[PDB]
Amino acid sequence: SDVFHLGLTKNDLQGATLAIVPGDPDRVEKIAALMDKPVKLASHREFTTWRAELDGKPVIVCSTGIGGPSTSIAVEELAQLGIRTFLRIGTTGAIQPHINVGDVLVTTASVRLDGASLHFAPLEFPAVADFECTTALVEAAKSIGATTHVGVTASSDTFYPGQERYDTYSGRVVRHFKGSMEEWQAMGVMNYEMESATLLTMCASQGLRAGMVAGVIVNRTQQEIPNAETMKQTESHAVKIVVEAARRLL
Amino acid sequence: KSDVFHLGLTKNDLQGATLAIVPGDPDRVEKIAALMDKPVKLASHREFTTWRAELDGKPVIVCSTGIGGPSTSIAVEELAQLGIRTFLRIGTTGAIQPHINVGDVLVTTASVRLDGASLHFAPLEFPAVADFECTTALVEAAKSIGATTHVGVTASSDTFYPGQERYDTYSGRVVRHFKGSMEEWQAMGVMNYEMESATLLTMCASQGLRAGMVAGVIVNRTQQEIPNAETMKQTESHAVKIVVEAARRLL
Amino acid sequence: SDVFHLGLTKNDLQGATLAIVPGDPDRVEKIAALMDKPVKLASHREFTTWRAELDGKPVIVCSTGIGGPSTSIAVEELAQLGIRTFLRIGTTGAIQPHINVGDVLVTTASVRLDGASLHFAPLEFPAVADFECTTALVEAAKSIGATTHVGVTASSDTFYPGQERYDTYSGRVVRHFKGSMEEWQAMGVMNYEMESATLLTMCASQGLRAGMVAGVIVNRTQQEIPNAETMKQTESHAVKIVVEAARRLL
Amino acid sequence: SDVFHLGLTKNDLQGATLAIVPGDPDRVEKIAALMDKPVKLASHREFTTWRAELDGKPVIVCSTGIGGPSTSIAVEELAQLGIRTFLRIGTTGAIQPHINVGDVLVTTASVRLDGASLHFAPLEFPAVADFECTTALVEAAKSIGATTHVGVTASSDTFYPGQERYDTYSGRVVRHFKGSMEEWQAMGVMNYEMESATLLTMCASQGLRAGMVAGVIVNRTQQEIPNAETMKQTESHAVKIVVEAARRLL
Amino acid sequence: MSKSDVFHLGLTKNDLQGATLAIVPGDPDRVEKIAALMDKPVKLASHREFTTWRAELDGKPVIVCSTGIGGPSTSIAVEELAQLGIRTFLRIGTTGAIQPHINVGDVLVTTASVRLDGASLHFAPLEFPAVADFECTTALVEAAKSIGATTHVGVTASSDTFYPGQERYDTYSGRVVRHFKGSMEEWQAMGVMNYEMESATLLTMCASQGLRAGMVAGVIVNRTQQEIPNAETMKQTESHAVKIVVEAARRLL
Amino acid sequence: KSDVFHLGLTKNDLQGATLAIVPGDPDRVEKIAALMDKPVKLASHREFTTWRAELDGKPVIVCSTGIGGPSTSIAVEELAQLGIRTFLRIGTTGAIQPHINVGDVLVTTASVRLDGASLHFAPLEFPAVADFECTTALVEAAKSIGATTHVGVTASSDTFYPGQERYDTYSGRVVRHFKGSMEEWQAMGVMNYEMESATLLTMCASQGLRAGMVAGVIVNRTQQEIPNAETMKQTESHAVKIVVEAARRLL
Ligand SMILES: O=c1[nH]c(=O)n(COCCO)cc1Sc1ccccc1
Ligand SMILES: O=c1[nH]c(=O)n(COCCO)cc1Sc1ccccc1
Ligand SMILES: O=c1[nH]c(=O)n(COCCO)cc1Sc1ccccc1
Ligand SMILES: O=c1[nH]c(=O)n(COCCO)cc1Sc1ccccc1
Ligand SMILES: O=c1[nH]c(=O)n(COCCO)cc1Sc1ccccc1
Ligand SMILES: O=c1[nH]c(=O)n(COCCO)cc1Sc1ccccc1
Ligand SMILES: [K+]
Ligand SMILES: [K+]
Ligand SMILES: [K+]
């Protein structure tokens, strides 16, 4: 291996410069199966890597795991191996009433409610997505047909208190995050997820291209427990968009 | 007489205009308005000068923000009160990347928040991000009229001197916080310095208003050059041509 | 021109060391008319400069505009040309019930609700006025006769949310400034304006003398809209003091 | 499932109140195998859960993945299921010259270089380990025989810049972390890892007991590349200590 | 012949007679009381709020030196004692409990402190834990068991003020700054035991400089029941805590 | 016996006094009180020593704060409870400017807040500013008795050593935040270091209490580290004379 965690060499990549980066290691094969000649490369900890082909060009699919820290490891080590473009496909909870379950969200930039982004750039630096990647994702969503919303995402280091969930062991939220969801809602923030702030900051401050897309499986203004079939169908719709966007970026 | 505190304008003066081109320099307001059909002076109070024009049969407003976030926040808020929902900023800038030349056009996706006014609308963690449709329109407009264009991050500073790490000053010193800051922004791929985008982009993105940012490069901080007057006017006119062309796509 | 913005040479000043710095460019001519032999030097952007004479000594009047950014440009470039003393005359909204419209406020130091001050000194540094300038302003106010209050001013980077105005497009104020006016009120803060924090910090941290005076045209505890007559009379009232204070400091 | 991510019900735990929480999902089976009646329960994303028996009492082993964010999910959901005591066993890079590879480190408290801890308590709150858990770990290390160091740990949201690694794609470290390792070294900080700040903060501020132990596989003052034999032995050595400590806390 | 090796304490290295441990109360009036519990106590110096006594414990010299109230004077005392050769510091203090289950007369051992002070920042950034030394904490817990006391072990909120930082409204202004409004309830929910005024500075400055520090306090008031402490119970609680800190020092010699 | 928690004073003990002189050193209290009429010791508890005296027929309190903001905040609050509305601090200081000599008198207009206690009364953005009347009285008193006086900004630190960038210590290190800080304050025109003014000035200015700050220079950091044990006594006597004369002007 050429890297500390991923278990990959430069040769394993076969000249690939683009990586699709899901959070869930189980999503990796599912994404790679959508493309030509899918091949398993490695699996260590939360990092599962597959190689495939898109229009005759080698492409990488690699899981980040949940959160900025494991994301930062995966992205850094992929960058060492030659990856220059990163496309994140994730799941999300929407916080705006007009966004429905099954909708697709493309992130222009993220609210930095994480710690890892600060290890690459000070807070004043925008967690902004690459313009070409964002364009490709928006065009891909319009290509396959989806209800799409474009805007700001709140990227949190926690699933519970940082997203103002009170259905917890303690049932309390720290002062800093008390009333925070309502504030983000008023500011037009679309949704909550857990990796985009880190990914977008670390790429935008290091000359790497990054894009972010997510499928809405829950809306916080109406529900908390989603359906275990609409979840899989929403994932498949978002996976279709991210692969189509990758086509436009090769 | 007046529906707002500072601009000295009424809702009827706008005639149903929803878009506004917002330059920093008050003398540039006439320059932009003259490029469009039927230019009319509306009001001139303090640093705020407002001209109304017509683009493709649709009314368009041109309003000076003045230098910096504070007066920009006054202008944008009061225009929004009057009915403006789309704001396109055209400015001047100093590039900090060696590959960006004088005369180049820069479209800002998002800004480094080295200002104070943005914090009055959203906490620092909120991205000073431009509207996607506005950014697209500016990029397309730059390609339409033909320009050397760079798209990326801008450092938006509350000062011209210390916040942009200028040492050619009265004191000759820069506060610890900004010492070595230019080199840091350079390494992070930040294209340039200006003084209004962080405030404009934050206050619009956090209030459901669309904002775009474009600037003409009149100086590059890495090369030994003294700003030329003839090139300064040419670059201004070039950037003005793009912001008007982009406004056509957003109405 | 020897400066980037003001459009003045060192010779244009004629050895002037004191400058009266108003916010309104339309107020420069008003202040210059109170002194002997007024001459318009330059008008560029929001910066309008007039050269006048006070007691056989040249005095500069130069507009800063609203807010710290242009104030920082104006003060720095005047310092480059040779100005060592700065006297700000402004308008203000009082937040204490005992301060009336038409009253004159002399600022000892300012609450730093601005960004530009941080570009000269860290937040812990006091936005304090020069003792001689403050003395001169207090003495000048007592000389011409005025209802004067001396104390702390809140200097904000915005007119609306930073001064907790809700009569706005959004009708919302960010969490940080929610309930802030009541807090400043309890702390004995007299008023809101938009330039003093920047001016006082940048002068006190660079060996320049600065003073701050303002006329009350609005009181936030009673009424938001001022008329026409009282507004103009308060401005003329305040201008007289700043010229009289300049006489003591030369 | 009773929880969102772990795929576990309260019944699955059989009355367990203690969990051993490694970062690596592959380590879960290894820890469980040291105890009686080891049984696999679930595996979803980076969360692999096993149940075993210690002195007749049920005990849980559950991987957190790398970093505070996924740790915060695992710890929250385990708490919901009934876990009250959390013992982390991890890997670490030592930054003190006197600490050797193969040594065992017990963390009293952590430097909070993470984001997730802030979602439970403000920065001023100490990321402190539970006294009983720390005692048990120190006693367990003394029981099986190990070279043990007790003290402060730097817990970082990144593996690279936050631990001041320059052997990276960019080769740069953000200003905030430039010279940070030398600072921690002078302050007597023993080591770097990636989960303790989150774990210790979230437990100490929610009435949960937490302990932290780690095996040194690298010392940053001498070498960077760990050997894949000492690594396995150090892990085994640390696993035996955490299991013995768990015995003392039942 | 020689008067002082340090700026404030008015002590020479010889005054210490080879002592490496110091008991550091906040109150200069408490110094004699602690010293009197050990063998052959003698007053060494008294300057400002720094009163110093030396005494003998199991044939080994021990220093008792007051810090005064707050981090600033604590930082002076600890630093100058360290210059004089002290390597182990044991703080004995008074405290106001904020948990309902902790009673007046109870003894609290601090594992680590919430840093509501300024002086700790002069030694380490806020992210650094104001954590007590493990051996010192162990010795204090064992000493509390030894002499018999109702003991609670956990986190302490260490404040730069007695009033607003501890959310007291019974004041001249009757107001508390936004930052500390509702702060007590927050600390209570986080399981914080009590308020005092020196531990954050002491623990941070020692833990970041290779010095061993321990923290123990006697509860003279519980904020969820009363505000004014009884004079008699105060003396008994102080005496109870003083006995524990000496017994802990015995285990650390 | 006592109306307050720490000072050991009743309001009756004060005899209607509204002004207090507040030295840091409890042993300086008797020295200040001896300069006025009818000096009597009232209480001595912890670092708080209180004397009462008479100035032009008006009762005045002298009460020590101890070193640092925390004990200062207790003393000031509890004196305010007893009816004190005007506070005058007399202290010792180390000058950091080359032009300020040992024996000079410094009047503080406002303080750099390098303390923690000030934050418990007002957020950092609030200026640690002295009362204008108190500052005036101190400047006039210094000119009255004759002294080399400097007026300006003071750095008020929660530590004597690292916060004032002293390296002559046990560890020999200074935390990153304060590394190079003295040079920064020097460039910013900060006169000196002391340990109570930020707390005192912030807590008074934000609670409607009048506060003044004066200090005698016993060390200049650019020329020495150790004060002279004779010039110290002379300088203290000098400053004490000024604070009593200022107190005369404020009754
Ligand atoms: O509300 C959310 N917040 C969020 O950060 N994500 C992203 O995925 C993080 C790991 O589940 C996904 C959702 S949607 C959801 C709601 C309940 C259970 C699982 C997912
Ligand atoms: O370096 C710059 N920084 C910057 O913030 N701007 C934007 O215009 C602000 C007011 O001139 C423009 C420039 S380019 C320049 C260089 C020298 C003199 C005037 C403009
Ligand atoms: O409330 C105020 N806040 C404030 O920052 N200022 C200073 O002048 C800013 C430009 O009008 C002046 C006032 S008074 C006022 C009230 C309504 C309209 C214009 C001024
Ligand atoms: O230096 C370190 N920093 C650190 O945070 N850890 C903890 O485990 C993080 C995931 O590998 C482990 C180590 S030791 C090391 C050194 C080289 C490659 C892999 C681990
Ligand atoms: O609530 C407290 N807060 C606190 O910081 N301490 C510690 O000693 C500080 C100086 O008395 C002690 C107490 S208990 C108390 C209550 C009322 C009057 C005196 C002490
Ligand atoms: O440099 C100083 N910094 C400072 O904060 N003070 C104020 O008095 C604090 C307790 O001595 C006094 C001085 S002068 C000095 C220098 C060496 C030993 C004692 C006093
Ligand atoms: K302006
Ligand atoms: K993870
Ligand atoms: K003290």
PDB file of N, CA and C in Angstrom, chain B residues 5 25-26 46-47 67-68 70 73 77-78 85 114 116-117 120-121 157-159 161-163 169-171 173 175 178 206-207, chain C residues 26-27 45-46 66-67 69 72 76-77 79 84 113 115-116 119-120 156-158 160-162 168-170 172 174 177 205-206:
ATOM      1  N   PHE B   5     -34.754  55.129   4.756  1.00  0.00           N
ATOM      2  CA  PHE B   5     -34.021  56.031   5.644  1.00  0.00           C
ATOM      3  C   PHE B   5     -32.858  56.769   4.978  1.00  0.00           C
ATOM      4  N   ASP B  25     -18.229  52.127  -6.426  1.00  0.00           N
ATOM      5  CA  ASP B  25     -17.956  53.518  -6.781  1.00  0.00           C
ATOM      6  C   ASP B  25     -19.213  54.229  -7.299  1.00  0.00           C
ATOM      7  N   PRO B  26     -19.587  55.339  -6.657  1.00  0.00           N
ATOM      8  CA  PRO B  26     -20.782  56.105  -7.044  1.00  0.00           C
ATOM      9  C   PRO B  26     -20.716  56.708  -8.450  1.00  0.00           C
ATOM     10  N   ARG B  46     -25.550  60.969   0.470  1.00  0.00           N
ATOM     11  CA  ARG B  46     -24.327  60.402   1.047  1.00  0.00           C
ATOM     12  C   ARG B  46     -23.469  59.709  -0.022  1.00  0.00           C
ATOM     13  N   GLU B  47     -23.214  58.414   0.154  1.00  0.00           N
ATOM     14  CA  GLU B  47     -22.458  57.628  -0.821  1.00  0.00           C
ATOM     15  C   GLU B  47     -23.376  56.819  -1.742  1.00  0.00           C
ATOM     16  N   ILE B  67     -17.722  52.034  -0.352  1.00  0.00           N
ATOM     17  CA  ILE B  67     -16.720  51.045   0.045  1.00  0.00           C
ATOM     18  C   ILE B  67     -17.101  50.389   1.373  1.00  0.00           C
ATOM     19  N   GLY B  68     -17.090  49.061   1.399  1.00  0.00           N
ATOM     20  CA  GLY B  68     -17.223  48.317   2.637  1.00  0.00           C
ATOM     21  C   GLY B  68     -18.610  47.816   2.977  1.00  0.00           C
ATOM     22  N   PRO B  70     -20.576  47.919   5.861  1.00  0.00           N
ATOM     23  CA  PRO B  70     -21.548  48.790   6.539  1.00  0.00           C
ATOM     24  C   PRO B  70     -22.507  49.560   5.626  1.00  0.00           C
ATOM     25  N   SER B  73     -24.552  47.092   3.456  1.00  0.00           N
ATOM     26  CA  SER B  73     -25.673  46.523   4.205  1.00  0.00           C
ATOM     27  C   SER B  73     -26.876  47.469   4.249  1.00  0.00           C
ATOM     28  N   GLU B  77     -30.270  46.329   2.075  1.00  0.00           N
ATOM     29  CA  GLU B  77     -31.459  46.207   2.918  1.00  0.00           C
ATOM     30  C   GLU B  77     -32.577  47.140   2.452  1.00  0.00           C
ATOM     31  N   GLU B  78     -32.215  48.387   2.161  1.00  0.00           N
ATOM     32  CA  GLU B  78     -33.183  49.397   1.755  1.00  0.00           C
ATOM     33  C   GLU B  78     -33.717  49.163   0.342  1.00  0.00           C
ATOM     34  N   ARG B  85     -34.800  41.893  -5.368  1.00  0.00           N
ATOM     35  CA  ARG B  85     -34.536  40.530  -4.911  1.00  0.00           C
ATOM     36  C   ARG B  85     -33.219  39.985  -5.463  1.00  0.00           C
ATOM     37  N   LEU B 114     -13.542  38.356   5.891  1.00  0.00           N
ATOM     38  CA  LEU B 114     -12.638  39.190   6.680  1.00  0.00           C
ATOM     39  C   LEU B 114     -13.307  40.531   6.982  1.00  0.00           C
ATOM     40  N   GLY B 116     -16.881  42.591   9.135  1.00  0.00           N
ATOM     41  CA  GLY B 116     -17.683  42.575  10.344  1.00  0.00           C
ATOM     42  C   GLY B 116     -19.177  42.496  10.088  1.00  0.00           C
ATOM     43  N   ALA B 117     -19.632  43.129   9.009  1.00  0.00           N
ATOM     44  CA  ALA B 117     -21.063  43.240   8.714  1.00  0.00           C
ATOM     45  C   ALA B 117     -21.749  41.901   8.430  1.00  0.00           C
ATOM     46  N   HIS B 120     -23.378  40.217  11.296  1.00  0.00           N
ATOM     47  CA  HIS B 120     -24.633  40.807  11.754  1.00  0.00           C
ATOM     48  C   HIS B 120     -25.851  40.143  11.100  1.00  0.00           C
ATOM     49  N   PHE B 121     -25.596  39.230  10.165  1.00  0.00           N
ATOM     50  CA  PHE B 121     -26.660  38.522   9.455  1.00  0.00           C
ATOM     51  C   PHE B 121     -26.597  37.012   9.663  1.00  0.00           C
ATOM     52  N   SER B 157     -12.235  41.914   2.562  1.00  0.00           N
ATOM     53  CA  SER B 157     -11.643  42.545   3.741  1.00  0.00           C
ATOM     54  C   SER B 157     -12.311  43.859   4.132  1.00  0.00           C
ATOM     55  N   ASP B 158     -12.392  44.102   5.438  1.00  0.00           N
ATOM     56  CA  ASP B 158     -12.916  45.360   5.966  1.00  0.00           C
ATOM     57  C   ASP B 158     -11.922  46.520   5.851  1.00  0.00           C
ATOM     58  N   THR B 159     -10.673  46.222   5.492  1.00  0.00           N
ATOM     59  CA  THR B 159      -9.688  47.272   5.218  1.00  0.00           C
ATOM     60  C   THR B 159      -9.009  47.074   3.868  1.00  0.00           C
ATOM     61  N   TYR B 161      -5.790  48.230   3.549  1.00  0.00           N
ATOM     62  CA  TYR B 161      -4.365  48.135   3.864  1.00  0.00           C
ATOM     63  C   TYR B 161      -3.962  46.910   4.714  1.00  0.00           C
ATOM     64  N   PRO B 162      -4.158  46.936   6.039  1.00  0.00           N
ATOM     65  CA  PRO B 162      -3.679  45.836   6.894  1.00  0.00           C
ATOM     66  C   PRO B 162      -4.350  44.488   6.620  1.00  0.00           C
ATOM     67  N   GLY B 163      -5.652  44.501   6.338  1.00  0.00           N
ATOM     68  CA  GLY B 163      -6.401  43.285   6.054  1.00  0.00           C
ATOM     69  C   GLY B 163      -6.039  42.646   4.726  1.00  0.00           C
ATOM     70  N   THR B 169       2.433  51.767   4.466  1.00  0.00           N
ATOM     71  CA  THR B 169       1.469  52.556   5.235  1.00  0.00           C
ATOM     72  C   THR B 169       2.158  53.514   6.203  1.00  0.00           C
ATOM     73  N   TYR B 170       1.352  54.310   6.905  1.00  0.00           N
ATOM     74  CA  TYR B 170       1.846  55.238   7.919  1.00  0.00           C
ATOM     75  C   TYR B 170       2.604  54.518   9.037  1.00  0.00           C
ATOM     76  N   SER B 171       2.000  53.462   9.578  1.00  0.00           N
ATOM     77  CA  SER B 171       2.605  52.698  10.668  1.00  0.00           C
ATOM     78  C   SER B 171       3.647  51.696  10.176  1.00  0.00           C
ATOM     79  N   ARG B 173       3.134  48.618   9.896  1.00  0.00           N
ATOM     80  CA  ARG B 173       2.908  47.375  10.629  1.00  0.00           C
ATOM     81  C   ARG B 173       1.559  46.748  10.292  1.00  0.00           C
ATOM     82  N   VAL B 175      -1.214  43.977  12.095  1.00  0.00           N
ATOM     83  CA  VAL B 175      -1.602  43.251  13.303  1.00  0.00           C
ATOM     84  C   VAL B 175      -1.349  41.742  13.157  1.00  0.00           C
ATOM     85  N   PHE B 178      -3.308  39.283  10.872  1.00  0.00           N
ATOM     86  CA  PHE B 178      -3.180  39.385   9.419  1.00  0.00           C
ATOM     87  C   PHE B 178      -1.741  39.271   8.906  1.00  0.00           C
ATOM     88  N   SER B 206     -28.533  34.469   3.300  1.00  0.00           N
ATOM     89  CA  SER B 206     -29.215  34.183   4.562  1.00  0.00           C
ATOM     90  C   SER B 206     -30.585  34.865   4.682  1.00  0.00           C
ATOM     91  N   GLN B 207     -31.013  35.544   3.620  1.00  0.00           N
ATOM     92  CA  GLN B 207     -32.285  36.268   3.628  1.00  0.00           C
ATOM     93  C   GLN B 207     -33.142  35.985   2.389  1.00  0.00           C
TER      94      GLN B 207
ATOM     95  N   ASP C  26     -21.783  65.447   2.276  1.00  0.00           N
ATOM     96  CA  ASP C  26     -22.555  66.680   2.115  1.00  0.00           C
ATOM     97  C   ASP C  26     -22.434  67.592   3.342  1.00  0.00           C
ATOM     98  N   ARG C  27     -21.726  67.110   4.364  1.00  0.00           N
ATOM     99  CA  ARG C  27     -21.513  67.853   5.605  1.00  0.00           C
ATOM    100  C   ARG C  27     -20.147  68.541   5.637  1.00  0.00           C
ATOM    101  N   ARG C  45     -15.102  59.254  -4.991  1.00  0.00           N
ATOM    102  CA  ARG C  45     -15.970  58.254  -4.360  1.00  0.00           C
ATOM    103  C   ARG C  45     -16.834  58.890  -3.264  1.00  0.00           C
ATOM    104  N   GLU C  46     -16.630  58.461  -2.019  1.00  0.00           N
ATOM    105  CA  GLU C  46     -17.350  59.011  -0.870  1.00  0.00           C
ATOM    106  C   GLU C  46     -16.493  60.000  -0.077  1.00  0.00           C
ATOM    107  N   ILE C  66     -19.958  56.157   5.639  1.00  0.00           N
ATOM    108  CA  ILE C  66     -20.536  55.300   6.673  1.00  0.00           C
ATOM    109  C   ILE C  66     -19.695  54.040   6.854  1.00  0.00           C
ATOM    110  N   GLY C  67     -19.328  53.751   8.098  1.00  0.00           N
ATOM    111  CA  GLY C  67     -18.668  52.504   8.431  1.00  0.00           C
ATOM    112  C   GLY C  67     -17.158  52.561   8.499  1.00  0.00           C
ATOM    113  N   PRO C  69     -14.639  50.482   7.093  1.00  0.00           N
ATOM    114  CA  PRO C  69     -13.823  50.291   5.884  1.00  0.00           C
ATOM    115  C   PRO C  69     -13.359  51.570   5.185  1.00  0.00           C
ATOM    116  N   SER C  72     -11.300  53.666   7.653  1.00  0.00           N
ATOM    117  CA  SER C  72      -9.936  53.141   7.710  1.00  0.00           C
ATOM    118  C   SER C  72      -9.074  53.618   6.539  1.00  0.00           C
ATOM    119  N   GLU C  76      -6.095  56.537   7.349  1.00  0.00           N
ATOM    120  CA  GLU C  76      -4.760  56.060   6.979  1.00  0.00           C
ATOM    121  C   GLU C  76      -4.082  56.967   5.948  1.00  0.00           C
ATOM    122  N   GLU C  77      -4.838  57.373   4.931  1.00  0.00           N
ATOM    123  CA  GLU C  77      -4.295  58.189   3.849  1.00  0.00           C
ATOM    124  C   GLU C  77      -4.047  59.639   4.269  1.00  0.00           C
ATOM    125  N   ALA C  79      -3.206  60.324   7.384  1.00  0.00           N
ATOM    126  CA  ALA C  79      -2.026  60.126   8.225  1.00  0.00           C
ATOM    127  C   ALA C  79      -0.748  60.078   7.389  1.00  0.00           C
ATOM    128  N   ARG C  84      -2.231  64.182  12.263  1.00  0.00           N
ATOM    129  CA  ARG C  84      -1.946  63.505  13.527  1.00  0.00           C
ATOM    130  C   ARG C  84      -3.123  63.554  14.504  1.00  0.00           C
ATOM    131  N   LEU C 113     -18.474  46.742  17.780  1.00  0.00           N
ATOM    132  CA  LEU C 113     -19.378  45.882  17.014  1.00  0.00           C
ATOM    133  C   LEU C 113     -19.072  46.012  15.522  1.00  0.00           C
ATOM    134  N   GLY C 115     -15.854  45.363  12.227  1.00  0.00           N
ATOM    135  CA  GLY C 115     -14.828  44.448  11.764  1.00  0.00           C
ATOM    136  C   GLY C 115     -13.478  45.106  11.554  1.00  0.00           C
ATOM    137  N   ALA C 116     -13.489  46.360  11.104  1.00  0.00           N
ATOM    138  CA  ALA C 116     -12.261  47.066  10.733  1.00  0.00           C
ATOM    139  C   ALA C 116     -11.298  47.299  11.899  1.00  0.00           C
ATOM    140  N   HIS C 119      -8.635  44.783  12.423  1.00  0.00           N
ATOM    141  CA  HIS C 119      -7.537  44.818  11.460  1.00  0.00           C
ATOM    142  C   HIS C 119      -6.368  45.677  11.956  1.00  0.00           C
ATOM    143  N   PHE C 120      -6.557  46.339  13.096  1.00  0.00           N
ATOM    144  CA  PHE C 120      -5.521  47.184  13.686  1.00  0.00           C
ATOM    145  C   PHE C 120      -5.092  46.710  15.074  1.00  0.00           C
ATOM    146  N   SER C 156     -21.497  50.094  15.543  1.00  0.00           N
ATOM    147  CA  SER C 156     -21.960  48.926  14.800  1.00  0.00           C
ATOM    148  C   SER C 156     -21.626  48.972  13.309  1.00  0.00           C
ATOM    149  N   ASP C 157     -21.321  47.803  12.748  1.00  0.00           N
ATOM    150  CA  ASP C 157     -21.070  47.659  11.316  1.00  0.00           C
ATOM    151  C   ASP C 157     -22.359  47.676  10.485  1.00  0.00           C
ATOM    152  N   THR C 158     -23.516  47.616  11.144  1.00  0.00           N
ATOM    153  CA  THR C 158     -24.798  47.773  10.449  1.00  0.00           C
ATOM    154  C   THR C 158     -25.685  48.820  11.113  1.00  0.00           C
ATOM    155  N   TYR C 160     -29.089  48.387  10.858  1.00  0.00           N
ATOM    156  CA  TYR C 160     -30.309  47.662  11.213  1.00  0.00           C
ATOM    157  C   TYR C 160     -30.129  46.540  12.254  1.00  0.00           C
ATOM    158  N   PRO C 161     -29.640  45.351  11.870  1.00  0.00           N
ATOM    159  CA  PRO C 161     -29.582  44.223  12.813  1.00  0.00           C
ATOM    160  C   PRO C 161     -28.626  44.448  13.988  1.00  0.00           C
ATOM    161  N   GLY C 162     -27.482  45.083  13.736  1.00  0.00           N
ATOM    162  CA  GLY C 162     -26.501  45.368  14.773  1.00  0.00           C
ATOM    163  C   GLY C 162     -26.959  46.409  15.779  1.00  0.00           C
ATOM    164  N   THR C 168     -37.536  45.760   9.243  1.00  0.00           N
ATOM    165  CA  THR C 168     -36.693  45.446   8.090  1.00  0.00           C
ATOM    166  C   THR C 168     -37.385  44.498   7.115  1.00  0.00           C
ATOM    167  N   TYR C 169     -36.702  44.203   6.009  1.00  0.00           N
ATOM    168  CA  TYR C 169     -37.187  43.260   5.002  1.00  0.00           C
ATOM    169  C   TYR C 169     -37.427  41.867   5.589  1.00  0.00           C
ATOM    170  N   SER C 170     -36.437  41.350   6.315  1.00  0.00           N
ATOM    171  CA  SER C 170     -36.533  40.017   6.909  1.00  0.00           C
ATOM    172  C   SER C 170     -37.316  40.013   8.220  1.00  0.00           C
ATOM    173  N   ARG C 172     -36.017  39.900  11.066  1.00  0.00           N
ATOM    174  CA  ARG C 172     -35.279  39.060  12.003  1.00  0.00           C
ATOM    175  C   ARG C 172     -33.920  39.661  12.354  1.00  0.00           C
ATOM    176  N   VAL C 174     -30.123  38.296  13.883  1.00  0.00           N
ATOM    177  CA  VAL C 174     -29.266  37.149  14.187  1.00  0.00           C
ATOM    178  C   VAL C 174     -29.102  36.957  15.700  1.00  0.00           C
ATOM    179  N   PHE C 177     -27.103  39.248  18.110  1.00  0.00           N
ATOM    180  CA  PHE C 177     -27.580  40.602  18.382  1.00  0.00           C
ATOM    181  C   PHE C 177     -28.999  40.660  18.959  1.00  0.00           C
ATOM    182  N   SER C 205      -4.028  52.834  18.542  1.00  0.00           N
ATOM    183  CA  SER C 205      -3.021  51.790  18.344  1.00  0.00           C
ATOM    184  C   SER C 205      -1.922  52.187  17.348  1.00  0.00           C
ATOM    185  N   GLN C 206      -1.969  53.427  16.862  1.00  0.00           N
ATOM    186  CA  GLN C 206      -0.985  53.914  15.889  1.00  0.00           C
ATOM    187  C   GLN C 206      -0.398  55.281  16.256  1.00  0.00           C
TER     188      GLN C 206
END
